[PDB]
Design an enzyme around this catalytic site. Structure first.
Site, PDB file in Angstrom:
ATOM      1  N   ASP A  33       9.914   2.861  -4.533  1.00 39.27           N
ATOM      2  CA  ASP A  33       8.642   3.390  -5.005  1.00 39.27           C
ATOM      3  C   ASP A  33       8.032   4.294  -3.939  1.00 39.27           C
ATOM      4  O   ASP A  33       7.652   3.827  -2.861  1.00 39.27           O
ATOM      5  CB  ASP A  33       7.703   2.237  -5.351  1.00 39.27           C
ATOM      6  CG  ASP A  33       6.339   2.705  -5.794  1.00 39.27           C
ATOM      7  OD1 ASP A  33       6.216   3.858  -6.255  1.00 39.27           O
ATOM      8  OD2 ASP A  33       5.385   1.909  -5.675  1.00 39.27           O
ATOM      9  N   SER A  36       3.998   3.506  -3.009  1.00 37.06           N
ATOM     10  CA  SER A  36       3.514   2.472  -2.105  1.00 37.06           C
ATOM     11  C   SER A  36       4.346   2.539  -0.830  1.00 37.06           C
ATOM     12  O   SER A  36       5.190   3.424  -0.665  1.00 37.06           O
ATOM     13  CB  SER A  36       3.576   1.082  -2.754  1.00 37.06           C
ATOM     14  OG  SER A  36       4.910   0.695  -3.025  1.00 37.06           O
ATOM     15  N   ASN A  38       5.173  -0.785   1.032  1.00 32.79           N
ATOM     16  CA  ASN A  38       5.553  -2.128   1.440  1.00 32.79           C
ATOM     17  C   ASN A  38       6.823  -2.566   0.725  1.00 32.79           C
ATOM     18  O   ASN A  38       7.117  -2.125  -0.391  1.00 32.79           O
ATOM     19  CB  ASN A  38       4.434  -3.133   1.150  1.00 32.79           C
ATOM     20  CG  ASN A  38       3.194  -2.885   1.986  1.00 32.79           C
ATOM     21  OD1 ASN A  38       2.212  -2.319   1.506  1.00 32.79           O
ATOM     22  ND2 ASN A  38       3.236  -3.304   3.245  1.00 32.79           N
ATOM     23  N   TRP A  40       8.498  -6.039  -0.665  1.00 31.24           N
ATOM     24  CA  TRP A  40       8.242  -7.438  -0.962  1.00 31.24           C
ATOM     25  C   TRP A  40       9.151  -7.897  -2.091  1.00 31.24           C
ATOM     26  O   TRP A  40       9.503  -7.123  -2.985  1.00 31.24           O
ATOM     27  CB  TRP A  40       6.772  -7.695  -1.327  1.00 31.24           C
ATOM     28  CG  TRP A  40       6.269  -6.920  -2.509  1.00 31.24           C
ATOM     29  CD1 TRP A  40       5.555  -5.758  -2.482  1.00 31.24           C
ATOM     30  CD2 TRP A  40       6.426  -7.261  -3.895  1.00 31.24           C
ATOM     31  NE1 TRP A  40       5.262  -5.350  -3.760  1.00 31.24           N
ATOM     32  CE2 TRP A  40       5.785  -6.254  -4.646  1.00 31.24           C
ATOM     33  CE3 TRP A  40       7.046  -8.316  -4.572  1.00 31.24           C
ATOM     34  CZ2 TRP A  40       5.749  -6.272  -6.040  1.00 31.24           C
ATOM     35  CZ3 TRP A  40       7.010  -8.330  -5.956  1.00 31.24           C
ATOM     36  CH2 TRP A  40       6.365  -7.315  -6.674  1.00 31.24           C
ATOM     37  N   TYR A  78      -3.784  -3.563  -6.950  1.00 36.53           N
ATOM     38  CA  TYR A  78      -3.618  -2.246  -7.557  1.00 36.53           C
ATOM     39  C   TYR A  78      -4.077  -2.336  -9.010  1.00 36.53           C
ATOM     40  O   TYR A  78      -4.694  -3.324  -9.421  1.00 36.53           O
ATOM     41  CB  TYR A  78      -2.173  -1.749  -7.420  1.00 36.53           C
ATOM     42  CG  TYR A  78      -1.186  -2.391  -8.367  1.00 36.53           C
ATOM     43  CD1 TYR A  78      -0.766  -3.701  -8.185  1.00 36.53           C
ATOM     44  CD2 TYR A  78      -0.658  -1.675  -9.432  1.00 36.53           C
ATOM     45  CE1 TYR A  78       0.142  -4.286  -9.047  1.00 36.53           C
ATOM     46  CE2 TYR A  78       0.249  -2.249 -10.299  1.00 36.53           C
ATOM     47  CZ  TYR A  78       0.645  -3.555 -10.103  1.00 36.53           C
ATOM     48  OH  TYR A  78       1.549  -4.129 -10.967  1.00 36.53           O
ATOM     49  N   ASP A 223       5.509  10.401  -7.740  1.00 38.11           N
ATOM     50  CA  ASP A 223       5.578   8.942  -7.709  1.00 38.11           C
ATOM     51  C   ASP A 223       6.745   8.469  -8.564  1.00 38.11           C
ATOM     52  O   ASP A 223       6.693   8.560  -9.795  1.00 38.11           O
ATOM     53  CB  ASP A 223       4.265   8.332  -8.204  1.00 38.11           C
ATOM     54  CG  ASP A 223       4.235   6.822  -8.079  1.00 38.11           C
ATOM     55  OD1 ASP A 223       3.232   6.217  -8.515  1.00 38.11           O
ATOM     56  OD2 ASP A 223       5.195   6.236  -7.532  1.00 38.11           O
ATOM     57  N   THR A 226       6.088   5.236 -11.193  1.00 36.07           N
ATOM     58  CA  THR A 226       5.288   5.400 -12.397  1.00 36.07           C
ATOM     59  C   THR A 226       6.177   5.969 -13.490  1.00 36.07           C
ATOM     60  O   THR A 226       6.875   6.965 -13.271  1.00 36.07           O
ATOM     61  CB  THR A 226       4.086   6.318 -12.155  1.00 36.07           C
ATOM     62  OG1 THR A 226       3.447   5.955 -10.925  1.00 36.07           O
ATOM     63  CG2 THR A 226       3.082   6.192 -13.290  1.00 36.07           C
TER      64      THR A 226
HETATM   65  N1  LIG Z   1       3.661   3.809  -7.813  1.00 36.82           N
HETATM   66  C1  LIG Z   1       3.170   2.489  -8.207  1.00 36.82           C
HETATM   67  N2  LIG Z   1       3.745   1.197  -7.778  1.00 36.82           N
HETATM   68  C2  LIG Z   1       3.063   0.138  -8.287  1.00 36.82           C
HETATM   69  C3  LIG Z   1       1.964   0.737  -9.140  1.00 36.82           C
HETATM   70  O1  LIG Z   1       2.028   2.172  -9.081  1.00 36.82           O
HETATM   71  C4  LIG Z   1       3.908  -0.710  -9.159  1.00 36.82           C
HETATM   72  C5  LIG Z   1       4.696  -0.025 -10.067  1.00 36.82           C
HETATM   73  C6  LIG Z   1       5.531  -0.770 -10.909  1.00 36.82           C
HETATM   74  C7  LIG Z   1       6.360  -0.209 -11.851  1.00 36.82           C
HETATM   75  C8  LIG Z   1       6.227  -0.638 -13.154  1.00 36.82           C
HETATM   76  C9  LIG Z   1       7.061  -0.124 -14.115  1.00 36.82           C
HETATM   77  C10 LIG Z   1       8.007   0.797 -13.710  1.00 36.82           C
HETATM   78  N3  LIG Z   1       8.121   1.181 -12.452  1.00 36.82           N
HETATM   79  C11 LIG Z   1       7.336   0.701 -11.518  1.00 36.82           C
HETATM   80  F1  LIG Z   1       7.476   1.119 -10.226  1.00 36.82           F
HETATM   81  C12 LIG Z   1       5.551  -2.159 -10.838  1.00 36.82           C
HETATM   82  C13 LIG Z   1       4.771  -2.847  -9.950  1.00 36.82           C
HETATM   83  C14 LIG Z   1       3.936  -2.086  -9.106  1.00 36.82           C
HETATM   84  O2  LIG Z   1       3.138  -2.861  -8.187  1.00 36.82           O
HETATM   85  C15 LIG Z   1       2.451  -2.092  -7.175  1.00 36.82           C
HETATM   86  C16 LIG Z   1       2.383  -0.713  -7.174  1.00 36.82           C
HETATM   87  C17 LIG Z   1       1.660  -0.123  -6.113  1.00 36.82           C
HETATM   88  C18 LIG Z   1       1.084  -0.941  -5.147  1.00 36.82           C
HETATM   89  C19 LIG Z   1       0.318  -0.364  -3.988  1.00 36.82           C
HETATM   90  C20 LIG Z   1      -0.279  -1.391  -3.036  1.00 36.82           C
HETATM   91  C21 LIG Z   1      -0.969  -0.968  -1.929  1.00 36.82           C
HETATM   92  C22 LIG Z   1      -0.948   0.671  -1.832  1.00 36.82           C
HETATM   93  O3  LIG Z   1      -1.276   1.294  -2.918  1.00 36.82           O
HETATM   94  C23 LIG Z   1      -0.299   0.941  -4.110  1.00 36.82           C
HETATM   95  N4  LIG Z   1       1.183  -2.250  -5.195  1.00 36.82           N
HETATM   96  C24 LIG Z   1       1.834  -2.879  -6.159  1.00 36.82           C
HETATM   97  F2  LIG Z   1       1.948  -4.256  -6.231  1.00 36.82           F
END
Ligand SMILES: NC1=N[C@@]2(CO1)c1cc(-c3cccnc3F)ccc1Oc1c2cc(C2=CCCOC2)nc1F
Ligand SMILES: *[C@@H]1O[C@H](CO)[C@@H](O[C@@H]2O[C@H](CO)[C@@H](O)[C@H](O)[C@H]2NC(C)=O)[C@H](O)[C@H]1NC(C)=O
Ligand SMILES: *[C@@H]1O[C@H](CO)[C@@H](O)[C@H](O)[C@H]1NC(C)=O
Length: 337
Positions: A33, A36, A38, A40, A78, A223, A226
């Site tokens: 991704d 973000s 991190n 985890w 988020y 991104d 997304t």
């Molecule tokens: N770019 C982006 N990542 C996501 C949301 O938007 C995120 C995306 C997804 C997601 C869902 C469906 C398809 N693809 C994905 F990456 C899933 C969990 C998720 O969970 C998080 C995300 C972003 C973040 C960030 C945390 C601190 C910094 O700012 C964003 N944290 C998550 F837990």
């Protein structure tokens, strides 16, 4: 020397590959991704009565000889929801088995995952590939740490995302280089404006010849985490009306599949180059076979927003190169069949 990572494609919405954590490597599927910073994955030390504790593969620090304890608790928030846990340090393998070993990588053991979000995800966790500026707990991200260990030649990484749902592979992440098999022509680059997300300036967005959005310039982020193309609510509402889409029951915008090929061309104009999306490319076919709009309205508030998100719809159509050496993003028409 550049590392190739297979990606699986779930319904054009999720793109995830396999990584390893520990010695021997425990395999986890992560979304790489760029939204973000991190890393985890779920932990065994979750609770028996939480449903998230029964869904994905779990990190077990007992089975790793390279594990060292950090213990610092983390809490991440988020849009869709939130998760929490504590930090650990271990070796990260990319892929789970050509590959590389990233040593002493601090990541997160997620012990609580409230919400219904993570139940829909076919992937175990997230590997953030954004700038350190948005890393919660100021944790050095994976790609920053691997470049500090000088494990690849070039300070870049690239994404091919196959928008053919049945095609193979679903995609490919290229650590340290660019894969010419998956794009025609030459790359053209945009300078990153804000070193936090992979943020870029956009001059304007043209929905055909009668509707102009992002008028007078706006900001966008590239991104991979997304699914859709995202813009301000009011602006996207104009776009859906111009293409004649109507909101369904769940929120998705639908358009009759006969009217697709008669829909306007949408041009993203940023950085002196113009990027076209024909209606066949910004409209998804979902199963009944119903055609859904690739655009979604969401107001991202300041200080991060307002933002346009060039998500998997845009990247699946343009091979994307993320360049940390010169802080720039590259685009090229992705190869299809
Ligand atoms: N770019 C982006 N990542 C996501 C949301 O938007 C995120 C995306 C997804 C997601 C869902 C469906 C398809 N693809 C994905 F990456 C899933 C969990 C998720 O969970 C998080 C995300 C972003 C973040 C960030 C945390 C601190 C910094 O700012 C964003 N944290 C998550 F837990
Ligand atoms: C991991 O644990 C350490 C100590 O428990 C946390 O503190 C870091 O330790 C380094 C060691 O050289 C020092 O530079 C700083 O005190 C801390 N570093 C940073 C970057 O904050 C640390 O916060 C935990 N997490 C990480 C990612 O290091
Ligand atoms: C991007 O920034 C670099 C930094 O020096 C500069 O050399 C280059 O010309 C810039 N490109 C554009 C299109 O502004």
């Amino acid at each position: 020397e550049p590392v190739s990572e297979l990606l699986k494609n779930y319904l054009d919405a999720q793109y995830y590959g396999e990584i390893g954590i520990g010695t021997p490597p425990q395999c986890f599927t992560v979304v790489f991704d760029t939204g973000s910073s991190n890393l985890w994955v779920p932990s065994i030390h979750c609770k028996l009565l939480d449903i998230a504790c029964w869904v994905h593969h779990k990190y077990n620090s007992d089975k790793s000889s390279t594990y060292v304890k950090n213990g610092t608790s983390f809490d991440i928030h988020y849009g869709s929801g939130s998760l929490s846990g504590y930090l650990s340090q271990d070796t990260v393998s990319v892929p789970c088995k050509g590959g590389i070993k990233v040593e002493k990588q601090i990541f997160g053991e997620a012990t609580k995952q409230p919400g219904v979000v993570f139940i829909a995800a076919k992937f175990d966790g997230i590997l953030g590939m954004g700038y350190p500026f948005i890393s919660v707990n100021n944790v050095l991200p994976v790609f920053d740490n691997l470049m500090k260990q000088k494990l690849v030649e070039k300070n870049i990484f690239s994404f091919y995302l196959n928008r053919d749902p049945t095609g193979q592979p679903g995609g490919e992440l290229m650590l340290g280089g660019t894969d010419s098999r998956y794009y025609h022509g030459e790359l053209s680059y945009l300078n990153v404006t804000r070193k936090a997300y992979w943020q870029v300036h956009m001059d304007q967005l043209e929905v055909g010849s009668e509707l102009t959005l992002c008028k007078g310039g706006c900001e966008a982020i590239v991104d991979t985490g997304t699914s859709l193309l995202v813009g301000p609510v009011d602006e996207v509402k104009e776009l859906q009306k111009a293409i004649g889409a109507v909101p369904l029951i769940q929120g998705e915008y639908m358009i009759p599949c006969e009217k697709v090929s008669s829909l306007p061309i949408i041009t993203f104009k940023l950085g002196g180059q113009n990027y076209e999306l024909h209606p066949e490319k910004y409209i998804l076919k979902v199963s009944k076979t119903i055609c859904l709009s690739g655009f979604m309205g969401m107001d991202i508030p300041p200080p991060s927003g307002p933002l346009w998100i060039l998500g998997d719809v845009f990247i699946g159509c343009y091979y994307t190169v993320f360049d940390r050496e010169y802080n720039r993003v590259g685009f090229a028409k992705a190869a299809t069949l």
